[PDB]
C-alpha cells in the first residue's frame, strides 16, 4: 500500500500489479512504421484485435500486468497500448530508453540530451499523450558502441532522478551484462534498479550468479524461444536458437537453488505483431507458441512446481520481484 | 493545361507550379522524432513559424513551389507540410521513397514489399491523411548497399506504374549516379523520369555530361553549401565542403554552355529544422545563408544573368524543367 507505478491507463497501486511479465511487447516495429504502413500487419484494427485476444488469454492464465519494453525505436505506440490494455483488462507499463535501432536524430545526441529525452517520457509523458513511462529500456549486442555507452549513462541518470528501473537487452553469449553493470555503476546506479535481460539465452551460471551476487535482477525473459524442429529455417534458427524451453526454465530453478530467488524476473519477450525481422515471422512464432503470453503460467510455473520449487517461492518470483523492481526507488 | 501534380494541399495544374525548387526540406529529422521530442526544435509551433517566415521570404523572391524530398526516414511530417504550405502560400510536393537511414522494419523488406509501400504513399495517401506523394526519393552514399539496390528497383517500379518522377541523393565525388542509372535502366525506367541529386557536390563535368547526354536530370541542388570561413568547424566542413556558391553556380552555366539547359534542376537542399546531424547545425546554417530558400533567386539567378545566360534560358531551368519533371509521365 502507498507506492505507485505508471501504466498506459494512469497510476496503479504497486500491490495491484500482481503476476507481472517484465519483458513483453505488443508490437516489435520501428518508429513511425505502424502509422505509415499499417497494412503490413493486415490493419491496425487486426493488430489490436489479435493483441486483445492474446492478452485476455494471458489474463485467464493469471497474468495481471505486462511491461511493454518497446522504446521509441521499437516503434512503441502508446495509444495502441492503452487501447488493448483497456480492452483486455491487463495493465501495461510503457518504456522509454533506446534499443539497438536508433535513427540519426537519436544517434547524434549527447548524454545530456538523451537524459532530457528519457526524463520527458517519464515525467512529462510520451509524445502528446501524457502517458508516462514506468521503465527505461537499453541495449547492447556485444561490446557497447560509443553511442550505446551514452544511452546507458543517460538511462542511469534518468533512473537516479526518477527512481524508475532500467532493463537491458544483451547478447547473453557475449556476457554483455558485465560491461552494462560497469557502465551503470560508474554512474552510481544501484544494481537493484537494473535488470540484465535475455539472460536465459546462455547457460553460463558463472556469468549469471556473478551478476545476481552483485544485486542485479537477471531477466530470464525468453522462455518459449526455441527453433528445435525448424532447423530448416535459418531465420528462426538465429533468433530462437537450439535450446528448449525446459532448458531455459531450468535456469530459474538453478538460480533459486543457488540462493538467488529474489534476483529473478521471468518473461517471454512475446509480441502480437513483428515488423523488424523477416516477413511472416509472427506466423512461425505463433506455431512454436500458440499460448503466447500464457506460456509461462501454463507451462513454466507447473514445470517448476513439479520439480519441487515451493509455491511461495514461485509467487515471490512472479509477483514480489516485479513489484519491488517496478516500484520507483 | 490539363496535367496535374499532387501537393500537400491537393492537386494543382502543372502550369501553376511556376518557379519551383526541386530538392528542399521543411525539416530534416527521423521517423517519429518530431512527435516524440518536439522541444528539440524549441517546439513544433516555433518550427512551423520559422518555416512559414522562411517560405514567405522565398515566395517574395519569386518562389511558387518547393519539392520537399523528406521521405519516411527523414521524418517527413505531411501535416506540418500542409500547415506551412497553406500559411505561406507556397505549394509543397511531398515525397515517398527511402533515404539512407531506414530502420529495421524497412531494411528487412523485399523489392515487392517496398514497391507496395511507395505505391501506397503515391496512390492511397501518406499515413491516414490522404495526402499523396508527387515524387520518390532514393539514396546511396557510395556503392549501393544490397538494401539500397532493392530501394532503387522498387522506386523504378513505383515510377513505372504511376508516372511520378524519381530523385536521388548521391555521394557526387564517388560518381554514384552511374550505378544509380544502371540499376534504374535495368528496370526499364526512362532517364527523363530521374534526377541525379547533389551533383553540384563535384566539378567532374565528364561525370555530369555523361549523365545529361543519356537523358538524366542533373540536380544542382546544394547551391548555398559552403564551409569557407568556418574551417575551424569540422562538422560544417564535412557537410558543406570548401567550394563556394559561385563555384557550384558555375556548373549550371557549364551544362547550359554544353547544350544541356533542359537537363538541369537547381535547388538549395535547405531546411528550417535539422535533427539528424550535430546540435545547433541550424544556427550555423542560418549564418552561412540568412536568405534560406530565397538564395537561388536573389543570388544565383542574377549571377547567371550577369555572366550572360539569357532570361529565357533561366526561365526554362527554373520553371519548364521542374514542370516537365514533376508532370506524371
Ligand atoms: Co531484446
Ligand atoms: Co524484447
Ligand atoms: Co541528400
Ligand atoms: Co536533401
Ligand atoms: Na523484438
Ligand atoms: Na524479439
Ligand atoms: Na538532410
Ligand atoms: Na542536408
XYZ file of C-alpha atoms and ligand atoms in Angstrom:
666
model
C 0.000 0.000 0.000
C 1.148 3.584 -0.884
C 3.686 3.146 -3.732
C 2.518 3.652 -7.307
C 3.532 2.659 -10.803
C 2.603 4.365 -14.063
C 0.766 2.326 -16.672
C -0.709 3.320 -20.061
C -4.078 3.932 -18.270
C -2.711 6.077 -15.399
C -1.260 5.283 -11.923
C -1.972 1.962 -10.149
C -1.052 0.762 -6.658
C 2.149 -1.381 -6.763
C 0.183 -4.088 -4.949
C -2.333 -4.433 -7.818
C 0.357 -5.259 -10.441
C 0.081 -8.901 -9.272
C 1.522 -11.580 -11.622
C 3.603 -9.442 -13.987
C 5.526 -10.334 -17.148
C 8.525 -7.895 -17.131
C 9.750 -8.099 -20.767
C 6.998 -8.250 -23.431
C 5.889 -6.259 -26.490
C 2.534 -5.608 -28.077
C 4.309 -4.956 -31.350
C 8.034 -5.037 -32.279
C 8.301 -2.458 -35.055
C 10.154 0.771 -35.920
C 9.455 4.425 -35.051
C 6.648 5.713 -37.384
C 6.086 2.349 -39.130
C 2.684 1.396 -37.746
C 1.362 4.881 -38.731
C 2.994 4.802 -42.210
C 2.251 1.180 -43.202
C -0.497 -0.429 -41.028
C -1.342 -2.973 -43.799
C 1.985 -4.674 -43.117
C 0.089 -6.069 -40.073
C -3.165 -6.629 -42.082
C -4.504 -3.451 -40.473
C -4.120 -1.629 -37.182
C -7.638 -2.994 -36.183
C -6.458 -6.581 -36.861
C -3.323 -5.947 -34.836
C -5.267 -4.583 -31.819
C -7.774 -7.467 -32.009
C -5.002 -10.123 -32.015
C -3.252 -8.293 -29.055
C -6.544 -8.085 -27.076
C -7.259 -11.874 -27.649
C -3.680 -12.735 -26.707
C -3.798 -10.592 -23.566
C -7.198 -11.951 -22.428
C -5.675 -15.432 -22.807
C -2.745 -14.376 -20.555
C -5.252 -12.771 -18.129
C -7.241 -16.096 -17.990
C -3.887 -17.923 -17.113
C -3.380 -15.464 -14.206
C -1.381 -12.666 -15.838
C -2.435 -9.238 -14.409
C 0.351 -6.925 -15.799
C 2.939 -6.823 -18.579
C 5.844 -4.398 -19.074
C 5.912 -3.470 -22.711
C 9.658 -2.797 -23.173
C 9.164 -1.186 -26.638
C 11.121 2.040 -26.828
C 10.884 4.838 -29.425
C 12.992 2.819 -31.892
C 10.937 -0.416 -31.496
C 8.058 1.782 -32.741
C 6.195 1.887 -29.393
C 2.619 3.168 -29.959
C 1.411 4.171 -26.533
C -2.169 4.771 -27.868
C -2.328 1.179 -29.142
C -1.012 0.020 -25.710
C -3.716 1.991 -23.931
C -6.406 0.681 -26.229
C -5.507 -3.025 -25.760
C -4.781 -2.688 -22.013
C -8.235 -1.229 -21.573
C -9.934 -3.809 -23.830
C -8.190 -6.893 -22.336
C -8.207 -5.690 -18.700
C -4.442 -6.238 -18.351
C -2.177 -3.460 -17.036
C 0.608 -2.355 -19.358
C 3.733 -0.477 -18.215
C 5.280 1.526 -21.059
C 9.065 2.087 -21.593
C 11.426 4.933 -22.501
C 15.103 4.358 -23.437
C 16.621 3.261 -26.751
C 17.026 -0.224 -28.257
C 19.711 -1.058 -30.880
C 17.959 0.559 -33.910
C 18.103 4.313 -33.185
C 17.899 6.758 -36.167
C 20.315 9.623 -36.816
C 18.253 12.113 -34.822
C 18.953 9.917 -31.696
C 22.464 8.658 -32.654
C 23.794 12.264 -32.913
C 22.713 13.139 -29.327
C 24.809 13.622 -26.214
C 24.347 12.034 -22.784
C 22.778 15.290 -21.538
C 20.319 15.363 -24.444
C 19.320 11.668 -24.046
C 18.763 12.170 -20.269
C 16.422 15.023 -21.085
C 14.533 12.840 -23.627
C 14.160 9.924 -21.125
C 13.070 12.282 -18.333
C 10.499 13.787 -20.703
C 8.917 10.362 -21.340
C 8.922 9.503 -17.547
C 7.972 12.918 -16.122
C 6.014 14.786 -18.824
C 4.516 11.992 -20.978
C 5.226 10.118 -24.219
C 4.593 12.378 -27.242
C 1.472 14.452 -26.617
C -0.424 11.792 -24.679
C 0.513 12.439 -21.028
C 1.116 8.680 -20.682
C 4.191 8.144 -18.574
C 6.949 5.533 -18.927
C 7.493 3.253 -15.967
C 10.765 1.760 -17.148
C 13.883 2.650 -19.176
C 14.990 0.036 -21.757
C 18.635 -0.042 -23.083
C 20.515 -2.437 -25.428
C 23.973 -3.727 -26.455
C 24.716 -6.515 -28.918
C 28.260 -7.262 -27.836
C 30.611 -4.588 -26.680
C 28.731 -1.259 -26.435
C 29.105 1.085 -29.341
C 30.192 4.605 -28.310
C 26.544 5.687 -28.697
C 25.339 2.749 -26.568
C 27.665 3.917 -23.728
C 25.859 7.311 -23.839
C 22.456 5.580 -23.754
C 23.459 3.519 -20.673
C 24.800 6.597 -18.758
C 21.676 8.598 -19.760
C 19.481 5.683 -18.539
C 21.399 5.603 -15.225
C 20.900 9.343 -14.732
C 17.213 9.268 -15.704
C 16.749 6.392 -13.182
C 18.649 8.215 -10.433
C 16.415 11.281 -10.868
C 13.050 9.400 -11.014
C 13.537 6.028 -9.202
C 12.263 4.176 -12.374
C 14.084 0.898 -13.015
C 16.368 0.138 -16.020
C 16.086 -3.110 -18.081
C 18.516 -4.306 -20.777
C 18.779 -6.335 -23.984
C 22.028 -8.314 -24.063
C 23.846 -10.771 -26.309
C 23.968 -13.258 -23.414
C 26.566 -15.451 -25.111
C 28.908 -12.473 -25.189
C 28.336 -11.727 -21.464
C 27.236 -8.056 -22.164
C 25.758 -7.599 -18.655
C 29.292 -7.352 -17.190
C 30.070 -4.166 -19.177
C 26.479 -2.914 -18.802
C 26.938 -3.245 -14.977
C 30.351 -1.469 -15.048
C 28.854 1.475 -17.007
C 25.780 1.733 -14.662
C 27.904 1.512 -11.527
C 30.294 4.174 -12.824
C 27.170 6.373 -12.786
C 26.288 5.425 -9.140
C 23.208 3.388 -10.126
C 22.153 0.730 -7.612
C 22.125 -2.823 -9.176
C 18.655 -3.380 -7.562
C 17.398 -0.786 -10.127
C 18.701 -2.827 -13.038
C 17.576 -5.997 -14.872
C 20.049 -7.723 -17.203
C 17.807 -9.175 -19.948
C 17.893 -12.136 -22.318
C 19.964 -13.868 -19.629
C 18.289 -17.196 -20.328
C 19.960 -17.073 -23.769
C 23.075 -18.579 -22.039
C 23.583 -21.451 -19.566
C 26.755 -19.766 -18.157
C 25.740 -19.747 -14.490
C 29.177 -18.272 -13.565
C 28.145 -15.236 -15.571
C 24.581 -15.197 -14.135
C 25.423 -15.793 -10.404
C 28.240 -13.222 -10.673
C 25.516 -10.639 -11.619
C 22.963 -11.909 -9.089
C 25.603 -11.779 -6.300
C 26.186 -8.024 -7.045
C 22.434 -7.349 -6.697
C 21.285 -7.229 -10.359
C 17.934 -8.688 -11.463
C 18.533 -11.419 -14.004
C 15.933 -11.437 -16.759
C 15.049 -14.980 -17.800
C 12.707 -13.422 -20.361
C 12.806 -15.595 -23.494
C 11.119 -18.753 -22.108
C 9.235 -20.021 -25.247
C 12.115 -19.263 -27.701
C 13.179 -22.482 -29.406
C 13.881 -23.361 -33.112
C 14.029 -27.123 -32.301
C 12.092 -28.855 -35.138
C 12.682 -25.910 -37.512
C 16.401 -26.116 -38.116
C 15.479 -25.884 -41.844
C 14.504 -22.265 -41.122
C 17.693 -20.170 -40.887
C 15.976 -17.002 -39.636
C 14.035 -18.856 -36.882
C 17.216 -20.690 -36.007
C 19.323 -17.496 -35.453
C 16.585 -15.770 -33.474
C 15.259 -18.614 -31.287
C 18.352 -20.893 -31.002
C 18.540 -24.634 -30.382
C 17.791 -24.812 -26.588
C 14.424 -25.996 -25.343
C 12.032 -24.058 -23.139
C 12.721 -26.661 -20.403
C 16.475 -25.836 -20.631
C 15.676 -22.096 -20.260
C 13.230 -22.842 -17.374
C 15.881 -24.963 -15.591
C 17.811 -21.681 -15.148
C 15.104 -20.271 -12.890
C 15.439 -23.277 -10.585
C 19.302 -23.191 -10.807
C 19.336 -19.583 -9.570
C 16.734 -20.345 -6.844
C 18.788 -23.396 -5.715
C 21.848 -21.102 -5.527
C 20.074 -18.672 -3.131
C 19.053 -16.112 -5.746
C 15.189 -16.389 -5.817
C 14.871 -12.564 -5.138
C 17.079 -11.730 -8.190
C 14.963 -13.386 -10.871
C 12.497 -11.876 -13.319
C 10.688 -14.275 -15.757
C 9.032 -13.409 -19.115
C 8.518 -14.426 -22.820
C 9.655 -11.484 -24.944
C 6.471 -12.235 -26.850
C 4.632 -9.927 -29.333
C 1.475 -9.799 -31.376
C 2.985 -8.082 -34.369
C 6.559 -8.059 -35.579
C 7.890 -5.941 -38.472
C 11.564 -5.568 -37.644
C 12.567 -9.091 -38.790
C 11.604 -11.371 -41.778
C 8.037 -11.357 -43.211
C 5.673 -13.885 -41.539
C 7.997 -14.458 -38.535
C 4.811 -13.894 -36.465
C 3.152 -16.994 -38.103
C 6.267 -19.011 -37.364
C 6.252 -17.745 -33.757
C 2.563 -18.487 -33.218
C 3.099 -22.079 -34.336
C 6.026 -22.517 -31.909
C 3.995 -20.993 -29.020
C 0.198 -20.808 -29.611
C -0.256 -19.927 -25.885
C 1.559 -16.539 -26.456
C 1.840 -14.671 -23.082
C 0.115 -17.529 -21.237
C 3.027 -19.934 -21.806
C 4.829 -19.011 -18.541
C 1.916 -19.632 -16.197
C 0.514 -22.657 -18.159
C 3.820 -24.454 -18.853
C 6.759 -22.900 -16.979
C 5.285 -22.420 -13.494
C 3.853 -26.010 -13.220
C 7.106 -27.378 -14.606
C 8.950 -25.667 -11.677
C 6.333 -26.789 -9.150
C 6.696 -30.391 -10.374
C 10.499 -30.112 -9.993
C 9.889 -29.111 -6.312
C 10.007 -25.303 -6.286
C 7.645 -24.199 -3.426
C 4.585 -22.168 -4.375
C 5.683 -19.317 -2.012
C 8.971 -19.193 -3.967
C 7.170 -19.102 -7.303
C 4.835 -16.275 -6.068
C 7.941 -14.378 -4.915
C 9.424 -14.574 -8.451
C 6.265 -13.598 -10.416
C 4.679 -11.075 -8.010
C 7.115 -9.808 -5.301
C 10.211 -9.373 -7.505
C 8.368 -7.339 -10.278
C 6.593 -5.201 -7.604
C 9.902 -4.421 -5.896
C 11.567 -3.782 -9.277
C 8.869 -1.512 -10.766
C 8.321 0.393 -7.515
C 10.125 3.761 -8.010
C 13.045 3.663 -5.547
C -3.132 22.998 -69.225
C -4.572 19.535 -68.288
C -1.733 17.744 -66.423
C -1.765 17.735 -62.629
C 0.647 17.309 -59.759
C -0.149 16.318 -56.184
C 0.834 18.710 -53.418
C 0.206 18.588 -49.645
C -2.980 20.693 -50.237
C -4.425 18.580 -53.094
C -3.977 18.587 -56.917
C -2.701 21.674 -58.794
C -2.329 22.339 -62.521
C 1.287 21.656 -63.664
C 1.303 25.172 -65.121
C 0.751 26.788 -61.691
C 3.889 25.198 -60.133
C 5.858 28.139 -61.613
C 9.364 28.768 -60.167
C 9.984 25.510 -58.296
C 12.825 24.427 -56.006
C 13.119 20.624 -56.627
C 15.172 19.469 -53.590
C 14.270 21.134 -50.257
C 13.098 20.089 -46.781
C 10.918 21.731 -44.181
C 12.634 19.633 -41.547
C 15.429 17.012 -41.811
C 14.673 14.636 -38.946
C 13.936 10.943 -38.285
C 10.699 8.921 -38.433
C 8.670 9.637 -35.216
C 11.144 12.209 -33.819
C 9.136 15.405 -34.214
C 6.166 13.698 -32.444
C 8.352 12.194 -29.663
C 10.654 15.171 -28.957
C 9.289 18.484 -30.378
C 11.323 20.536 -27.825
C 14.479 19.549 -29.692
C 13.265 22.233 -32.168
C 12.114 24.620 -29.352
C 8.557 23.471 -30.066
C 6.558 22.318 -33.061
C 4.874 25.840 -33.110
C 8.324 27.506 -33.278
C 9.341 25.152 -36.063
C 6.205 25.894 -38.151
C 6.593 29.655 -37.573
C 10.250 29.647 -38.743
C 9.247 27.508 -41.840
C 6.333 29.872 -42.683
C 8.641 33.001 -42.402
C 11.307 31.273 -44.486
C 8.802 30.217 -47.148
C 7.149 33.671 -47.362
C 10.662 35.065 -47.903
C 11.185 32.578 -50.787
C 7.691 33.459 -52.115
C 8.625 37.222 -52.061
C 11.827 36.331 -54.137
C 9.588 34.591 -56.728
C 9.477 31.011 -55.440
C 5.990 29.464 -56.039
C 6.658 25.720 -55.282
C 9.138 23.516 -53.429
C 9.536 19.723 -53.537
C 10.047 18.555 -50.006
C 12.195 15.439 -50.622
C 11.812 14.191 -46.997
C 10.942 10.515 -47.006
C 9.649 8.351 -44.129
C 13.177 8.034 -42.692
C 13.927 11.810 -42.850
C 10.894 12.062 -40.524
C 8.577 13.690 -43.108
C 5.510 15.162 -41.325
C 2.984 15.707 -44.069
C 0.616 17.572 -41.646
C 3.368 20.090 -40.846
C 3.991 20.445 -44.633
C 0.312 21.120 -45.244
C 0.137 23.617 -42.422
C 3.136 25.707 -43.604
C 2.246 25.438 -47.321
C -1.169 26.827 -46.505
C 0.170 29.555 -44.182
C 2.988 30.748 -46.511
C 1.046 30.357 -49.788
C 3.800 28.204 -51.330
C 2.983 24.826 -52.910
C 4.764 21.828 -51.423
C 5.187 18.480 -53.215
C 5.692 15.626 -50.745
C 7.964 12.554 -51.319
C 7.840 8.781 -50.821
C 10.944 6.545 -51.125
C 13.705 5.869 -48.594
C 16.826 7.892 -47.734
C 19.967 6.312 -46.175
C 18.620 5.979 -42.579
C 15.912 3.288 -42.835
C 15.001 1.305 -39.649
C 14.821 -2.487 -39.409
C 11.142 -2.598 -40.353
C 12.166 -1.116 -43.794
C 15.638 -2.751 -44.113
C 14.114 -6.276 -43.819
C 11.711 -5.708 -46.767
C 11.816 -7.103 -50.283
C 11.562 -5.218 -53.583
C 7.910 -6.310 -53.874
C 7.120 -5.037 -50.373
C 8.882 -1.658 -50.911
C 7.023 -1.158 -54.245
C 3.765 -1.691 -52.405
C 4.792 0.850 -49.706
C 5.792 3.505 -52.323
C 2.604 2.920 -54.332
C 0.592 3.315 -51.124
C 2.099 6.771 -50.473
C 1.542 7.860 -54.165
C -1.867 6.251 -54.792
C -3.622 5.922 -51.411
C -2.034 8.679 -49.274
C 0.706 9.122 -46.664
C -0.347 7.562 -43.332
C -4.022 8.304 -42.714
C -4.031 11.754 -44.304
C -4.966 11.106 -47.956
C -2.088 13.422 -48.938
C -0.332 11.956 -51.930
C 3.389 11.881 -52.762
C 4.418 13.510 -56.009
C 7.962 12.178 -56.075
C 10.020 9.141 -54.995
C 13.332 9.924 -53.221
C 16.192 7.307 -53.086
C 19.791 7.431 -51.742
C 23.270 5.846 -51.985
C 26.425 7.018 -50.235
C 28.948 5.250 -52.427
C 28.308 1.866 -53.895
C 24.704 0.811 -53.137
C 24.221 -1.488 -50.211
C 22.203 -4.623 -51.072
C 19.171 -2.936 -49.463
C 19.751 0.261 -51.478
C 19.619 -1.816 -54.720
C 16.128 -3.015 -53.639
C 15.049 0.575 -52.904
C 16.192 1.746 -56.378
C 14.378 -1.136 -58.206
C 11.246 -0.545 -56.060
C 11.433 3.203 -56.914
C 11.747 2.358 -60.636
C 8.696 0.090 -60.480
C 6.611 2.557 -58.452
C 7.518 5.249 -61.055
C 6.682 2.985 -63.999
C 3.233 2.275 -62.523
C 2.351 5.916 -61.601
C 4.442 8.220 -63.884
C 5.838 10.021 -60.735
C 9.488 11.031 -61.095
C 12.429 9.626 -59.045
C 15.103 11.882 -57.422
C 18.346 10.727 -55.764
C 20.888 11.593 -53.070
C 24.416 10.763 -54.231
C 27.987 10.987 -52.970
C 28.899 13.045 -56.054
C 32.635 12.613 -55.516
C 32.155 8.863 -55.779
C 30.135 9.192 -59.029
C 27.097 7.236 -57.573
C 24.742 8.367 -60.381
C 26.458 5.944 -62.806
C 25.383 2.881 -60.765
C 22.040 4.503 -59.871
C 21.410 4.905 -63.665
C 22.461 1.280 -64.411
C 20.043 -0.043 -61.735
C 17.127 2.183 -62.984
C 17.727 1.274 -66.618
C 17.866 -2.436 -65.783
C 14.282 -1.855 -64.594
C 13.246 -0.112 -67.889
C 12.915 3.339 -66.279
C 13.285 6.282 -68.668
C 16.185 8.644 -67.630
C 13.790 11.632 -68.171
C 11.955 10.319 -65.041
C 15.102 10.516 -62.943
C 17.097 13.325 -61.269
C 20.622 12.565 -60.034
C 20.976 14.800 -56.944
C 23.789 16.559 -55.105
C 25.530 16.712 -58.491
C 26.926 20.155 -57.741
C 28.988 18.485 -54.983
C 31.553 17.637 -57.751
C 33.112 19.652 -60.602
C 33.617 16.443 -62.685
C 31.822 17.588 -65.838
C 32.793 14.286 -67.568
C 30.634 12.573 -64.979
C 27.820 15.177 -65.249
C 27.654 15.494 -69.103
C 27.824 11.685 -69.381
C 24.538 11.593 -67.335
C 22.960 14.574 -69.110
C 23.765 13.017 -72.528
C 21.793 9.837 -71.529
C 18.749 11.979 -70.634
C 19.020 12.223 -66.811
C 18.149 15.431 -64.936
C 21.194 16.653 -63.061
C 20.328 18.107 -59.672
C 22.498 21.118 -58.866
C 20.660 21.292 -55.541
C 23.170 22.383 -52.885
C 23.809 25.976 -54.079
C 24.391 27.783 -50.702
C 26.514 24.952 -49.163
C 29.947 26.307 -48.280
C 32.140 25.986 -45.105
C 34.579 28.676 -46.388
C 35.354 30.890 -43.339
C 34.438 28.079 -40.905
C 37.215 25.592 -41.490
C 37.579 25.592 -37.660
C 34.228 23.766 -37.591
C 34.819 20.105 -38.516
C 31.129 19.178 -38.778
C 30.287 22.185 -41.024
C 33.381 21.419 -43.046
C 32.405 17.755 -43.807
C 28.812 18.654 -44.628
C 29.230 21.874 -46.649
C 32.750 21.412 -48.144
C 35.259 24.036 -49.257
C 33.736 25.155 -52.635
C 31.953 28.474 -52.938
C 28.373 29.011 -54.050
C 29.787 30.742 -57.171
C 31.765 27.541 -57.991
C 28.553 25.464 -57.629
C 26.577 28.043 -59.706
C 29.242 27.961 -62.461
C 28.123 24.342 -63.053
C 24.683 25.480 -64.187
C 26.272 27.688 -66.843
C 28.827 24.942 -67.795
C 25.993 22.495 -68.519
C 23.973 25.172 -70.400
C 27.084 26.083 -72.474
C 27.467 22.362 -73.292
C 23.898 22.146 -74.711
C 22.258 20.690 -71.609
C 19.923 23.536 -70.404
C 16.876 21.106 -70.468
C 18.684 18.607 -68.150
C 19.242 20.909 -65.184
C 17.320 21.217 -61.933
C 18.517 23.870 -59.383
C 17.849 23.967 -55.600
C 19.334 24.582 -52.073
C 18.705 21.429 -50.042
C 17.700 23.916 -47.369
C 15.654 23.218 -44.176
C 14.105 25.041 -41.272
C 14.828 22.398 -38.688
C 17.536 19.771 -38.626
C 17.835 16.978 -36.031
C 19.749 14.288 -37.882
C 23.182 15.973 -37.547
C 25.022 17.889 -34.719
C 23.095 20.153 -32.282
C 22.768 23.797 -33.461
C 23.783 22.986 -37.076
C 20.665 25.034 -37.993
C 22.201 28.185 -36.333
C 25.419 27.578 -38.230
C 23.442 27.137 -41.473
C 21.356 30.273 -40.956
C 24.519 32.331 -40.514
C 26.015 30.937 -43.750
C 22.750 31.607 -45.670
C 20.299 34.012 -43.936
C 18.262 34.163 -47.207
C 17.302 30.422 -46.792
C 15.179 29.317 -49.829
C 15.447 32.779 -51.408
C 19.193 32.424 -52.057
C 18.756 30.936 -55.572
C 16.551 33.678 -56.979
C 18.302 36.558 -55.081
C 21.929 35.481 -55.655
C 22.230 32.585 -58.122
C 19.869 33.693 -60.906
C 21.311 37.280 -61.182
C 24.818 35.846 -61.032
C 23.968 33.723 -64.142
C 22.248 36.643 -65.876
C 25.336 38.814 -65.284
C 27.536 36.047 -66.762
C 25.327 36.214 -69.928
C 22.778 33.414 -69.509
C 19.593 34.609 -71.354
C 16.467 35.143 -69.274
C 14.513 32.646 -71.480
C 17.189 30.050 -70.616
C 16.951 30.804 -66.908
C 13.092 30.545 -67.009
C 13.485 27.197 -68.802
C 15.671 25.872 -65.938
C 13.514 27.100 -63.000
C 10.002 26.690 -64.474
C 9.915 24.449 -67.612
C 12.326 21.732 -66.416
C 10.554 21.196 -62.982
C 7.101 21.225 -64.699
C 8.228 18.607 -67.218
C 9.912 16.579 -64.450
C 7.025 16.624 -61.939
C 4.366 16.048 -64.604
C 3.389 12.337 -64.260
C 4.634 10.709 -67.485
Co 15.890 -7.607 -26.703
Co 12.230 -7.571 -26.320
Co 20.684 14.148 -49.785
Co 18.130 16.687 -49.032
Na 11.986 -7.627 -30.674
Na 12.417 -10.288 -30.102
Na 19.328 16.347 -44.852
Na 21.269 18.026 -45.858
